[PDB]
Design a binder for this molecule. Sequence first.
Ligand SMILES: Nc1ncnc2c1ncn2[C@@H]1O[C@H](COP(=O)(O)OP(=O)(O)OP(=O)(O)O)[C@@H](O)[C@H]1O
Lengths: 86, 86, 224, 52
Amino acid sequence: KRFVILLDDVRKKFCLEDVGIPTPDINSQSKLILTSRYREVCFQMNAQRSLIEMQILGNDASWELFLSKLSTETSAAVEPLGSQSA
Amino acid sequence: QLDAIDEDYSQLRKYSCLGQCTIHAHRRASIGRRVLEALDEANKLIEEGRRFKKFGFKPLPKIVDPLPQIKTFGLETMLSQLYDLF
Amino acid sequence: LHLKSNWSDLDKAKKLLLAVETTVRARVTAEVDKLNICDPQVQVWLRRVEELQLDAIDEDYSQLRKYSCLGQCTIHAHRRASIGRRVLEALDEANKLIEEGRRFKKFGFKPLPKIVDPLPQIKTFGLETMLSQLYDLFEKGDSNIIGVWGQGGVGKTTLLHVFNNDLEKKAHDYQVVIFIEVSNSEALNTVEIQQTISERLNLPWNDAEPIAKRARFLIKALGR
Amino acid sequence: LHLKSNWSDLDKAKKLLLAVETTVRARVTAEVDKLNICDPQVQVWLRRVEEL
Ligand SMILES: Nc1ncnc2c1ncn2[C@@H]1O[C@H](COP(=O)(O)OP(=O)(O)OP(=O)(O)O)[C@@H](O)[C@H]1O
């Protein structure tokens, strides 16, 4: 089958064939996406040529994420625009 | 739709006061054969649905099953990068 | 005049046949998912359902309906003669297919083991010249026991993986290619080696059988 | 003649016979793998299929 395996939060190098997952190759259409905190682990798992860095949130998006976390009355204190308050 | 013949038979009941008249024999001829046309089907449906022993089959797994869909802010740019590799 | 009722019964049979076929195909797909192959008798039944093409007579009957306005005359009765016998020709086949596919109990059979099953195919560099040396004995060498030696990490195991996977590309007279990992221990974990051989020879695993008795059995089995 | 219908049913029987024979041979090959010998009654049946 043409599978896609999303491998979440790997913390050590492990062998795919020992867990049952075949390593995808160029001849096969299958993909395998793994996430980890360590670039060393992603290099050990042969993902060096397709590495993506998960960067922190932007200045604007970090604020509206903070806004959605506040209660209705608390948000109304820091929501208002046009006027400026401390 | 067994109620259809019931209404058709219901009108013949009003003509049943002189059912031996050749004019009303036109309706009585049809009903006398239409009842048998729906009686055998009704009885066949009895012995079929009374004979079932399994009523459902487990469907094949979905291609991709949904995962927790939380509200996300500012994730469009990074998700675009991931798809550009995938 | 039996066509008006028989064609109605054909529609019931057709819609029931699609239901039985759907059950069989879903049941067969659950077998192919287990790497089994669809049973040959089921495959014949499925192929007959596909080839039936019940929509062909439906269109032919649809044209007779337009001729049905004055079908009593011999001008339009020519079409009605064929349909009145063609419906029964497809009704009995449809009903026969109903009671055949409803009578299946096994839908797949486990295929025989492959001559050589693929092993991990990693990207290898500069291994062509050594693989040529290994093949030069395997094809031509006088002794039937071949030994490959080298320091740790030089590529001995990877040579076997690329050698085993290369056999399935070429043509050879051999019947089974077994890859056994004796590296598990220096204590020779005999049971797990016999499991690999028996699984590769399509043999049943008699768990309680003593090791010495199995070893005598495998010698006879591998000797064939 | 009635040949036009009988020969059509022969084709169905032939393709079904090849399916039953395939099941039997695969079942027999699973027996020879256990060093057993093909059952004499099955061997007679198989030999008649080949000779057909
Ligand atoms: N030609 C090659 N190209 C790329 N990598 C290779 C090649 N030959 C061996 N390797 C690498 O060598 C690594 C060491 O494992 P390998 O199977 O080669 O060991 P080995 O020679 O059997 O040694 P030992 O079993 O003593 O550890 C493997 O991860 C494999 O990727």
